[PDB]
Amino acid sequence: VNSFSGYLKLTDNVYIKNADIVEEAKKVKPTVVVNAANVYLKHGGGVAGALNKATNNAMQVESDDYIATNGPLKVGGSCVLSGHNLAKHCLHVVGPNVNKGEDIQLLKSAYENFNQHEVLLAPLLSAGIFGADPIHSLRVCVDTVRTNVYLAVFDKNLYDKLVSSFL
Numbered sequence: 209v210n211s212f213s214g215y216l217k218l219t220d221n222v223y224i225k226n227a228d229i230v231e232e233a234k235k236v237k238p239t240v241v242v243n244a245a246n247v248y249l250k251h252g253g254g255v256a257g258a259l260n261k262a263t264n265n266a267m268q269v270e271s272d273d274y275i276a277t278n279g280p281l282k283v284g285g286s287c288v289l290s291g292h293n294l295a296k297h298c299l300h301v302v303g304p305n306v307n308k309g310e311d312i313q314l315l316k317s318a319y320e321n322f323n324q325h326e327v328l329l330a331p332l333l334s335a336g337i338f339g340a341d342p343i344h345s346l347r348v349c350v351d352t353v354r355t356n357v358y359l360a361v362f363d364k365n366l367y368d369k370l371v372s373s374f375l
């Protein structure tokens with residue numbers, strides 16, 4: 209049993225809810241929240257801008273030190289940093305950005321990072337400001353992630369379309 213409430217069960221391991229990921233993290237304080245990161249960990253907008261704002265910019269300060277030491281992530285890659293006031297850990301995952309011309313085949317590699325964690329609160333990778341089709345992102349998630357993933361989809365309209373169209 210875990211603390212996640214109000215989710216629709218899609219599969220053995222994948223759950224979904226119309227919820228802003230920021231407010232969900234603050235309520236649950238999950239072990240792992242996933243950020244929709246870019247390779248520079250520049251948390252300007254979308255999910256990343258919203259979680260960084262909720263940490264009062266502490267996520268960005270930690271991220272800048274990480275990049276100064278290690279250099280940029282890979283598209284499809286990840287790193288584990290603090291969850292600050294939102295979670296124990298934040299898993300920063302880089303899905304391909306269609307609005308930068310990145311290979312959508314990298315979306316499966318991105319979701320494979322989730323398998324290193326038993327339970328996660330996450331957004332749909334490459335959705336929102338990253339330009340991919342969220343229906344596709346949900347299909348790759350279900351077909352790639354084997355650990356228990358709780359998805360927070362804020363756009364009520366999109367949530368209803370994801371559920372209605374789910375095979």
Ligand SMILES: c1coc(CNc2ncnc3nc[nH]c23)c1
Pocket residue numbers: 227228229230254255258331336360361362
């Ligand atoms: C209300 C509208 O957006 C938010 C911040 N959370 C958020 N932003 C963007 N994409 C999201 N996906 C889940 N939660 C998200 C709150």
